Amino acid sequence: DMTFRYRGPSPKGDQPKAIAGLVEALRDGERFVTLLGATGTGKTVTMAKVIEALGRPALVLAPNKILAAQLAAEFRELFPENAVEYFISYYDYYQPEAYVPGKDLYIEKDASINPEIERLRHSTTRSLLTRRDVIVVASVSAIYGLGDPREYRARNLVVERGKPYPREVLLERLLELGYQRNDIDLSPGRFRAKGEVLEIFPAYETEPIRVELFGDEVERISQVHPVTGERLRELPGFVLFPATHYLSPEGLEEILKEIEKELWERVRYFEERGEVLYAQRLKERTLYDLEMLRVMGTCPGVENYARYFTGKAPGEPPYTLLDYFPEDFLVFLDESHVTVPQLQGMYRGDYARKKTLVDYGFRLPSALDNRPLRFEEFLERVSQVVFVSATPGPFELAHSGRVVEQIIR
């Protein structure tokens, strides 16, 4: 009753019984529970009552970004005072890198990307570390790979007013958090320093922060409007979280060395096979990528090298959004009959795409380690799953210990 504050309509009819039935199932420790028949507003009202009753952070997956947006909006109304995050990915809107051999066609990752996507993703991980009253609503792309959250947690930056913090150190720690310097265009995940004035745009923020320095002392802190410069608030201080989710305790040069080692092995493989074109394709793309990394700390498609930034071993499952929750979160799978098959086939479908890229020299084999979880890998990262559907599919009915009805036609 303390974590979340439900401000919405009261359930009528038998809906209180469906809420109680789910709460009973989950408090029993049932691993698989099905809500059957719920539709429209009553669906999210029941979920919300269950989430409030149990007081745990919640992950809610939808078949696609559009339905996730609808769910998030409903949840924002039912919990106006809690963090309702919306988690989506590039792959919800744009075509991935791919190569179809039958037509000798390379499809590049879309370079012109909406910055809102990374902003929402960063708002999500920021909330999941800073508070318990989080409900993340996401497409199935939550279970695609992400970086080490142990480093995301540990690599923060605390600024208080009326204290230094000398200047040249603040710019060092900003670059350590992945913030690029751009004085022309200040967009999220970037900073600007002219004189004793420092403008920091946190990767999760809609409004950058203005830090004014008098010598070492932090003279003034103000949150500023992005387009007009208008001061909107004064800040006593703030905690800055990183600007990428791929953060390693190993050094960048060391990482780039590990990657080049794999590059030359793989070129040796192609060259020994007479596949000159694949080797030179692979060198051009990989070296270009590492050079963008070395100079800017990040590159487009850095997630291809995710194994090297997380210390995972080949074949090991990667970190996902699942690792950014506290230990006791709760999963709902909306449109269970669609969402479960999606979860089941993420790996094989992703693997199919990247294996072609790896076979023909577009990517190193290590890129296969930046992958969605296998369905049993998913089921091992979660404690309890609530399947939500009016037409629950075979997996839900085969494995649920409880199936609670909510038929309001």
Next chain:
Amino acid sequence: FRGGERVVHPRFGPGTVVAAQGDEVTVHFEGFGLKRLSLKYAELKPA
């Protein structure tokens, strides 16, 4: 749990642990049959 252990569940009563894979424990209960449970939340006590 290794399997065979006697446990007691706050609502299902006496049961016997069948399997255990990580946080998932499978317990067979007199009244309710086989249950696939989460260890964090089952509140199992040893019998």
